[PDB]
Amino acid sequence: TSIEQRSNAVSQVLLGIFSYVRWPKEPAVLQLCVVGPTEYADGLLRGMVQANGRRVHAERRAVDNPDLGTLCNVIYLGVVDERERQQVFRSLAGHPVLSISERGTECSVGSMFCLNVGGPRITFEANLDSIARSGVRVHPSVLKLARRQAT
């Protein structure tokens, strides 16, 4: 599976996940921030559209932007260090933000979902603590998407 192939797939898995999530004040345009170095975010940085027609606007922002929490609805988190990671999740505390990381190491440190972009399919894990404190509602059937992503 090539990088273009995986990036495209990451896009559709992210749409999949978004469809199980609700924000307390649903915006007309869903804002996505890509934070830190990423390999697979070029597809989602094109912008996306959800099944109901709501647009997902994407852009990159710096790790140390203190207003990440009010600047977006969704965070796609790349490869950052301990300090940077702390920085980011302290910015998000108390705000209704969905967090997904590109690598599956981050479910232990604050990300709600962590992708494993490797093998034949994009799979992901989730973290209940981070989900519970996130300020958004995640429907538990989101794990249907994950389960089906093996085989």
Q: Is 139 annotated as a binding residue?
A: yes
Q: What is the resolution of this structure in A?
A: 2.4
CA dihedral 130, 89, 138, 103 (to 10 degrees): -80
Tokens of 100: 């997904």
For residue 22, say whether it is annotated as part of any ligand binding site: yes
Method for structure elucidation: X-ray
| Distance (Å, whole) CA 126 – CA 62 | 24
Alpha helices in 19-116 (DSSP H): 68-71, 82-92
Distance CA 115, CA 102 (A): 5
* Cβ–Cβ < 8 Å for 17, 142: yes
Q: Give strand pairing partners of 126.
A: 113
Question: Strand, helix or coil at 83?
Answer: helix
Which residues have a Cβ under 8 Å from the Cβ of 56 and sit 6 or more positions away? Answer: 15, 18, 29, 30, 31, 32, 44, 47, 48, 49, 50, 74
Residue at 110: amino acid letter: G
Order of strands across the sheet with 29-35? 48-49, 55-61, 29-35, 74-77, 98-101, 113-117, 122-126
What's the residue count for the chain? 151
| SS3 per-residue string spanning 95-120 | CCCEEEECCCCHHHCCCCEEEEECCC
Q: Which residues, 6 or more positions from 108, have their beta carbon under 8 angstroms from its beta carbon? A: 127
Q: Residue 31 in contact with residue 18, Cβ under 8 Å?
A: no
